[PDB]
Design a protein around this ligand. Structure first.
Ligand SMILES: Nc1nc2c(ncn2[C@@H]2O[C@H](COP(=O)(O)OP(=O)(O)OP(=O)(O)O)[C@@H](O)[C@H]2O)c(=O)[nH]1
Ligand SMILES: O=C([O-])C(=O)[O-]
Ligand SMILES: [Mg+2]
Ligand SMILES: [Mn+2]
Length: 615
């Protein structure tokens, strides 16, 4: 067998044998075990610079930061190539792509057979959740991509410290990744190796994750979406907890009372910006802190509360639109020690993306840039062709500790108590600004039936309304109808303690006017919606009952510092009967597709909403 170069601190015989089997299959030239040190990170970055995958940015403008640009075919998630290969198809559900496990194993085995020829297999040990904590889970990702290795260092607890927790007998999540571009001897590589054929496959029975053909973070950082959502949602279903596509934030009012909220928005629909928003004018004495921006693990306790942890260690966030007005905490976070992917390159060796001109002199575009495809870019080219300097799904990768608004409990394994949930899709019509569910069941209905317009975070036509229950359409690890039942059973467990359940809200920042522009300013101004939620949590906020729940009146929000009239508020909060009749018919189509094991409570809630519309 090939020399594994197993470090002395790896004491797990079962792990070593698994690496041996995977090395025998993928046939890498060499094997390197990542220790996760800062020194190793710098060596791997220099190796990426040598390969042309990375360009080191200007140390004076963006210290210890790098820029990568990808193949145009490998810029986002590929949902059609993502599979849940459960033993039974009914345990994948209509929202997932299924294939018989042995049939998929026969499909992938020749693809991974020799996939790493001419490359180095990097062994990437990582922990999701704080190292050695009772809620943490350890995985090992084998990858032939140093880009994956350095991004995993930022996004997870990565390296040799994992093996101290694993010991001689600890179990791990087996993760295999390849760019699917084996190299012949003497063959020159490309700067972004990938394959037109891609597979992202999950075997829930064995917790195996197999990724082929893509270097993009969503497809290749196997601890993130593949384990911490798809695999972990299965485990939580069996063990009584949740893995959710949710940010976690803390918010403290001027009276010193602190609350925590978890919000599920679909990919590229506002989680990162909300999770670290800065309270605008009129909110002196308020503070917003970040626990996480993408994934939450949640379980109930005996005290009747729901406790949430963020299992990740960094942010892998959409770049375009970020500036000092929309998200200054993020701007400050990516000041250094950041990996940028598919943004533009300035003449001075800095990065640039659409939206940064809002902080520029005269709010003007840069005179010249090199776009994410390596082409010359000018304001004239952009004005005449609409060419974007940064890809719409371009990303930054940055450690959570770079965030000035990072909550002191961001890595507390005890978690934070969730006082309210928020669900919200990208909807140009229909959905009002904010609505409070009348009960846990009606809140689960809200989350189960939410829709959202597609974004550049996955390949395909953007701007199309689709059902995205709980913002988990691309990430649910089992049948979506059983997942609905899981949320309903959780609420009953909480209610049996005698506790008051967390409120559930539906939000929409994205209503559009006749010109296609957003009616609600959003970003920092979303604090005015969050503050009403806090009022409702304290029992001091008023609201009016309407078809889908309780909404604030104009006088129930704080408008200090924002010129937003009562007429504008009426536009984004009015319940339009015709629009919601059409929307409920789209709910019925969803329920038809999800008929198997669909909870009866959802059809009962729908019938109640239909009555309120026909009243
Ligand atoms: N109009 C408007 N745009 C927003 C708002 N919040 C975020 N955006 C924009 O929407 C895009 C997505 O924002 P993010 O906060 O990164 O979305 P996300 O949910 O974190 O996306 P993922 O990381 O893929 O899960 C960015 O271009 C933002 O500039 C908002 O409140 N109003
Ligand atoms: O990468 C992400 O956060 C996504 O696609 O949801
Ligand atoms: Mg995000
Ligand atoms: Mn996400």
């Amino acid at each position: 067998g090939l020399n594994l170069n197993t470090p002395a601190y790896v004491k797990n015989a079962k792990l070593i044998a698994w690496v041996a089997d995977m090395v025998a299959l993928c046939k890498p030239d060499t094997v390197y075990w990542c220790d996760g040190s800062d020194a190793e990170y710098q060596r791997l970055c220099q190796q990426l610079v040598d390969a042309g995958t990375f360009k080191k940015l200007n140390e004076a403008k963006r210290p210890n930061s790098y820029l990568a640009c990808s193949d145009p075919s490998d810029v986002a998630r590929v949902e059609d190539r993502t599979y849940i290969c459960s033993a039974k198809e009914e345990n994948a559900g209509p929202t997932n792509n299924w294939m018989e496990p042995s049939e998929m194993r026969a499909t992938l085995q020749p693809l991974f057979d020799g996939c790493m020829r001419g490359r180095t297999m990097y062994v990437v040990p990582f922990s999701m959740g704080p190292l050695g904590s009772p809620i943490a889970h350890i995985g090992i990702e084998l990858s032939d991509s140093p880009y994956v290795a350095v991004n995993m260092k930022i996004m997870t607890r990565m390296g040799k410290a994992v093996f101290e927790v694993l010991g001689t007998e600890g179990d791990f999540v087996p993760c295999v990744h390849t760019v699917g571009a084996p190299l012949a001897e003497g063959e020159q590589d490309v700067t972004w190796p990938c394959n037109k054929t891609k597979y992202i496959v999950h075997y829930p029975e064995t917790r195996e994750i197999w990724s082929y053909g893509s270097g993009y973070g969503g497809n290749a950082l196997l601890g993130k979406k593949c384990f911490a959502l798809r695999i972990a949602s299965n485990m939580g279903r069996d063990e009584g907890w949740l893995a959710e596509h949710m940010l976690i934030l803390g918010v403290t009012n001027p009276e010193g009372k602190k609350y925590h909220v978890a919000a599920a928005f679909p990919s590229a629909c506002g989680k990162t910006n909300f999770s670290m928003l800065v309270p605008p004018a009129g909110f002196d004495g308020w503070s917003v802190t970040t626990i996480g921006d993408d994934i939450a693990w949640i379980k109930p306790a005996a005290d009747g509360k729901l406790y949430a942890i963020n299992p990740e260690a960094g942010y892998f966030g959409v770049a375009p639109g970020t500036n000092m007005l929309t998200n200054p905490n993020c701007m400050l976070s990516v000041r250094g020690n950041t990996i940028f992917t598919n943004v533009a390159l300035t003449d001075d060796g800095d990065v640039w993306w659409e939206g940064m001109e809002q902080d520029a002199p005269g709010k003007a575009l840069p005179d010249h840039l090199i776009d994410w495809q390596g082409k010359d870019w000018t304001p004239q080219i952009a004005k005449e062709t609409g060419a974007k300097a940064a890809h719409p799904n371009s990303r930054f990768t940055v450690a959570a500790t770079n965030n000035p608004a990072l909550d002191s409990a961001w890595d507390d394994p005890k978690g934070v108590a969730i006082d309210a949930f928020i669900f919200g899709g990208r909807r140009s019509t229909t959905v009002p600004l904010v609505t409070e569910a009348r009960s846990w069941v009606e809140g689960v209905y809200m989350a189960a039936t939410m829709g959202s317009e597609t974004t550049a975070a996955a390949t395909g036509q953007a701007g199309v309304v689709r059902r995205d229950p709980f913002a988990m359409l691309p990430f649910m690890g089992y049948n979506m109808s059983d997942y609905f039942q899981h949320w309903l059973d959780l609420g009953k467990k909480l209610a049996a303690s005698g506790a008051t359940l967390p409120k559930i809200y539906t939000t929409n920042w994205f209503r559009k006017g006749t010109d296609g522009k957003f009616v609600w300013p959003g970003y920092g101004e979303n604090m005015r919606v969050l503050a009403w939620m806090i009022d409702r949590i304290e029992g001091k906020g008023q609201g009016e009952d309407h078809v889908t729940g309780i909404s604030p009146s104009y006088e129930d929000l704080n408008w200090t510092g924002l010129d937003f009239s009562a007429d504008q508020f009426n536009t984004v909060t009015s319940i339009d009967k015709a629009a919601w009749l059409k929307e409920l018919e789209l709910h019925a189509e969803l329920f038809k597709q999800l008929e198997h094991h669909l909870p009866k409570e959802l059809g009962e809630t729908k019938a109640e909403i239909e009555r309120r519309l026909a009243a």
